[PDB]
């Protein structure tokens, strides 16, 4: 699965980037659901963004988990709530109010899916 | 009211009363746990009974659910395939764990009909895989994995 | 909802990228769909991009705004409209061509849709 | 059509990034289901990254092809087996172990879909 | 056979299997009433068997559990909702109550198809019930009451 | 995967998992049976699980408990119907034995859609039969047999 | 719910009219169905009555149970029962044999259905 | 069956209730539909009644014929004809115009419906 | 159509149960569904009654509306609502709280409905 | 025309052309009454055939029929079961009976989907029944009752 | 009840209505012979009519057709088809076996759907094949024989 | 949302804003008159936007329109059909009466499949006659009836 | 009555209305012309509403609407398409005349439906001709055609 | 045609008229603007009616009514709910707005059957937002606005 | 039900014939689907037989279970399983190579199924 992190610029952390990741990685293999070397996680810092029209200092934490499709609701709604999880206890704060966090499940077409090995080992 | 409702409802209703069972078979630490699992299916039983208008469980239940099969799973670390129920206690806990599947199944039929209960269907999910560990840990410490 | 904006590295604007969100999110706002604060918009500038295989000097501006599923086709359509004239009417130039503006408009699965805020006020 | 690909700073490859884009779209264009100027492809490498809980050395490439609903699904196996090949081709090295190549094939709604050329030429 | 039928008399042999451990559970005066249960059980199981053929359950056992229900009434006056299982022995008697209340979905199932079993469906239902009361009472004897 | 397919799979470990907290209250023959049926079902699941891809069990498994069966029916010799758990221990076996048929009933949809588990199916319906006369077996021996 | 009992003038009780509405009502209330103030029952004696054809000393015992739309056939033969195990204890003798007690239970239209409360306390 | 008929208290018969009851009964047994001891009809007259807005002196006849479910509809026809005809040649006369005589069937469910005899002999 | 209107003998009216009536037909005729010779409505004194299980002193107001099949939900519904607002106004008071009034609109079956007209005039 | 108008109008023309061959077999009470309601036949045929527009039968018809039923119920007091047709004469009734009953099935289809014909099914139910007795009668006169 | 269940017993009460007027045209010994078919459509009736809860005609009295038609098969060695009706008494008999056919179809139609009547439906086919050699017996003795 | 809930919600809008034309006609009474049901309107727009979550109009509503349909009612005692319009003020009201009884078609599509807006509809019923009475007597008043 | 009936009963009912208001923003000529469209609608209601039982307008009707159609097409001989209302009271025509073919898509349901107003439908049709030519005609003669 | 192309096409025809109604009501200013909206009805109408073959409206069209809705988005900021038509001009666009909403229903349901008039659907949305600020303005110059 | 058991003639048994039917009634009467005196059971050797084209000596035992229609699949299957065990277990040798077992189940039509019993006793 492939799993993208947006937070913006003006957003702090209780850890790293890397540490963010880890913890994102360890929580989806959890679930039993997929294979570990299969886990394949980003982290992007937005650094133009706007959050709505007011004039009101805000930032926003996002997560996009996209897994090939079979799995029944139960489980993806278990994989985003997961996400949110680790994402919500990994904010320590951004702005002058508070941080939305959210988490999007995607389904990748498993048939036209094309993957390969290369430079093997 | 609606079969699947009713349905759905009943084996939630069903699940609790077979951990209120288990929890005499248990210590205090996890009787405690399955007490506060008690509470929540009959949070989600007022969610699916009422067709969603009333507000089921929150996301930090799942994200308590989480916390403690992350805490379990350190404690498991098993390869090969084992028999259910090593000992009287964790057969308790093998049997609500598929209960609690047999409940997922109903509130799965419920949410792609009604489009309500994917909160409860996830927590349910992960409901399962804490009650595998938490027999699987009653097993370790008195010794009685049997295996395949 | 979430917007992400993706502008060639030689594609001139009329505005700046944070002033560009602004119109953006008020065109988004001027649907009466969602909430102000709900409305999280970024900008990213390509800096590798290729279009096509001729040998010319082009510049493209793509969109896509991912709204939780329930509206209508109408809706969609009006919002990706909305976009398109914001981004159409930013642009100045680029390349030694027309450039061409697009804009996506996806559905995320609401049933598996997490959502918290963190560090309230 | 919209191709984003994705590279870990880790990852070495056999031609540059554009070099790749220009492989990527020549691909594309031999299907002979999209004109030559609507092939809009980006290159972008990932700084923030984490392949699953091990503590080895890895590195992936991951594309996704996005094309407006119609064509069968042997067109998009077909394209997404395209891509694979010329990424595949293109890795030299990662990590300590095999690289993983991953190609999605995705639909836009291309009833909703908004196209507009500015500054004709 | 056809299916409805077999369900419905696969989950009531259930329901009396499980009553068959709960009397082991219960005081002397319970378990006559359990084993009495049995007994109407298994005349209902050949009713819906034998498709209408064969008698079911009379009036009177209706009004039997009626007697019992309005009885355990006035021992049990709690108002706000209880966690299942208060004791072990209570427990036993919740999880029955719940495998009622599946006999009864199986059986309405019957009876809306077959236009049978309605006598049997008011029994289960009424049943149910009393298997509250007589959870609740146990508990109240021990103390043991737990509150959502 | 497909509904029919993981309701008898999920079914299926409910049973082992029943016989897995039964096999606490047999003598030490029975409990070597019982592990026996647990690693039999395991085998099963794999079948039905794979949708017919992995090798179920083996005609000598259902030779087994035909073995099993002939020489208890030489045990049990009783006219008049009887109460399910004449004893706590039989009791037990008796909800195994309806759980089994449980799984039976959820079996024999696959093999009515799918055309496997036929094997299978035969297996959990001479099991069913086998839990009845251990479970009348125990009653026999301790005298407690209760008829109606 | 409207509970209507009808009783020949030759019919003998083992308790009064208002002590029978009292144990109907205590009966209803058993089921958990409905609230107590709902439950609205009332008792008639008939003068003229005939039961069949034949030259024989006769009394009868008939209810009508009339409750909204929505209960299962399970409900619905359960209040029947225990109304008529209510009815059947309540009778003494009548006529020069037995005495048949009905029970009737019926659904009345929810949607139609008007209901206010008046003078209000 | 259950039998109900209600006569305003300024209608003339040409016999009593008693014998007006009696007639019923024999028509409703001319049917083969029902046990003779099975047919309970009372009759009863009304005081307190209005027949329209209109300030004309009239009086009329009804029934109500209450059977378990099962029959045709040929067979609820013919029962309500059939008990048209007794009530129609009963009437004498009521107020200074033409008397208005109707007869309804309805079916009371079987399945919920309970039934016992008592003090038996 | 047929109306019958019970009240309990506790029941104060603010109007004779003659003036009721004839207020409730004038209700009815006012929906224009039925002619006026047809509507034929009478009241009936409820002697013995028990309204739940509680120690209260109550009085209650019911209707009951049967009519031929045909009609519509929303005519059904209009109907009760319209005797409900007659019968709410005529209420003075009754026990020591408030008075339930209460309307059921029931369907008559009418193709097996009999009707006649005796001493024509 | 729509197919039930057609067959039930088909089957009631050919009740009436039994009648008109029955009552050549009868005396002229009988005949009286058969020419009655061979006119009665006629209306309902018109009404059926017109699908409902033209005006059936009256109420005082079917009245005019248990006038009939009523009067030979006091002649007819038999309990055993007969064979029909004890004489030639009541066997052409009892034809009579079994058509007019034919009749009845096609007119209640016509009643079920295009909601006419009531009155007129009501009658054709009476009518078999008259036919009915009306035979018994004849038997019973020349004293050739045969019994099962 | 059901309608094909109805229509069926309406045709066969029609069948033996027919057989009841057509006895009053043949010798002491078919007429003998007609009301025995009589008495087993009544035992026919009550079966298709309670829906197979009564029994129906024993196995013997197919067997007693069939000794019948072997016993005038020796009688009729026709080659060429005949017109129906060649005398005014084997007329009767061609209707009644008309109608039996009829009656046949209507039975088939409930084995099809209820699963009952193969014996019934054996006995009519049987049936419609005497009455057919009845009839040209008649017209042998008499030698009006009229071909195609 | 569904379809015959937002087709119900845009013809009710379409109602009170036709209304709201027709307000700018009538005299000062009327006008207080239609603005209540534009409010009635905008309740009940909201109960059947929120899918019934959202309360209705009360059981008053209906019995204020009542209260002038029968005031109005004794100054309209016309025989003759009239044609609409009499007058360019009451033509108004007539277009009002015709989109309101529109609304109540979409309404009752929704209270026949999803069990909600029966209130509403005997409102909406209610009004079209009220309208009705509106429009008559408005050309009452100004004489200029036109009849067919 | 059936739905498609009552909602072409429904907008004839809404289509007369909205003539009733137009024809106070005609002449003195236009307005008798419209009246006597409005007593054809009152004919055609009666026979829809009546469902073909009622006799509706006569073939004469829709041969009036073409003498005047031809009449007003000597008057309008425009080529490029115009803009709705280009005065008032020309607009008031322009919504009559799409309300028109709106009772004319209803109507069509019914004549495939029911096999009635056929000559209805037809009249429909060339009503929302003539008021075509009649809004087109009050543009010339103020002249203010708008066009694309 | 198709029944859905012939319903939308005659729905937009519809709000169109009634625009050209209430463009006599409007100052110059908006005149022009719904002018220009009656020529893109037009446009919409030829694709729709065409059933894609010919091209409908630009992105620009709908573009342009984004300009005027976030101009008159700056003169109206209202919180509470209001009643529609607070004068007589602006309920002419209360009117129009509820027809274009329910042409936007009639073109949805081509667009799902036939994939075609998405751009036109957008259209309609739009114009119902901007056909509600136009006539909020006109309210509030004239200080008419009435809440609920 | 009919039980035929087939065995080649150079096939050796552990048991007689005999003593082989007695097994296989004992097993089908196990399962307690049929009546004791309901199990007929015959044993056939075949004389004339060949297996294959190949010049090796075989030797096979089949049998075929008639049982009327009714039972499930489970039933059928496990009838089949039984008789198989019993027969397998009866082989000592035959031939050259491996004796191959066969147990077929068939299903008699109930409707048409004709039952007698003569010289009762």
């Given at each position: 699965?492939?799993?993208?992190?947006?937070?913006?610029?003006n957003?702090?952390?209780?850890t790293?980037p890397?540490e963010?990741?880890?913890?994102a990685?360890k929580?989806?293999?959890?679930?039993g659901?997929?294979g570990?070397?299969?886990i394949?996680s980003r982290?992007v810092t937005?650094?133009?963004?706007r959050?709505?029209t007011?004039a009101?200092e805000?930032?926003?934490?996002?997560?996009?988990?996209?897994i090939?499709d079979?799995?029944?609701?139960a489980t993806?709604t278990?994989?985003?709530?997961?996400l949110?999880?680790v994402?919500?206890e990994?904010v320590?704060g951004?702005?002058?109010?508070?941080?939305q966090?959210?988490?999007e499940?995607r389904?990748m077409?498993?048939?036209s899916?094309?993957?390969?090995?290369?430079?093997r080992? | 009211?609606?079969?699947?409702?009713i349905?759905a409802?009943?084996?939630?209703?069903?699940?609790?009363?077979?951990?209120?069972?288990?929890?005499?078979?248990v210590?205090?630490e996890?009787?405690?746990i399955?007490?506060?699992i008690?509470?929540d299916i009959?949070?989600?039983?007022?969610?699916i009974?009422?067709?969603?208008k009333i507000?089921?469980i929150?996301?930090?239940?799942?994200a308590?659910?989480?916390?403690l099969?992350?805490?379990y799973?350190e404690?498991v670390?098993?390869?090969?395939?084992?028999?259910?129920?090593?000992?009287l206690?964790?057969?308790?806990?093998d049997?609500?764990?598929t209960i609690?599947?047999?409940?997922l199944?109903?509130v799965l039929?419920?949410?792609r009909?009604?489009?309500?209960?994917?909160?409860?269907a996830a927590?349910?999910?992960?409901?399962?895989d804490?009650?595998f560990?938490l027999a699987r840990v009653?097993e370790?410490?008195?010794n009685?994995?049997k295996?395949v």
């Open positions: 699965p492939h799993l993208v992190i947006e937070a913006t610029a957003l702090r952390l209780e790293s890397g963010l990741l880890e913890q990685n929580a989806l293999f959890a679930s659901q997929f570990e070397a299969d394949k982290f937005l650094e133009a963004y959050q709505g007011a009101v805000r930032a926003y934490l996002h997560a996009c988990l996209s090939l079979g799995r029944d609701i993806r278990l994989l985003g709530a997961s949110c999880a994402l919500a990994a320590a951004g702005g002058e109010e508070g941080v966090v959210s988490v499940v389904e077409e498993r048939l899916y094309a993957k390969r090995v290369v430079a080992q | 009211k609606d079969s699947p409702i349905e409802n009943g084996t939630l209703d069903e699940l609790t009363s077979f951990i209120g069972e288990a929890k005499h078979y210590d205090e996890m009787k405690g399955l007490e506060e008690q509470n009959y949070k989600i039983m007022g969610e009974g009422s067709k969603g507000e089921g929150s996301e930090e239940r799942i308590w659910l989480l916390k099969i992350l805490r799973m404690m670390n098993l390869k090969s395939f084992v028999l259910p129920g090593g000992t206690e964790s057969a308790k806990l049997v609500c764990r609690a599947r047999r409940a199944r109903k039929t419920v949410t009909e009604f489009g309500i209960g994917a909160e409860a927590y349910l999910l992960a409901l399962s804490l009650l560990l009653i370790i410490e008195k009685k994995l295996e």
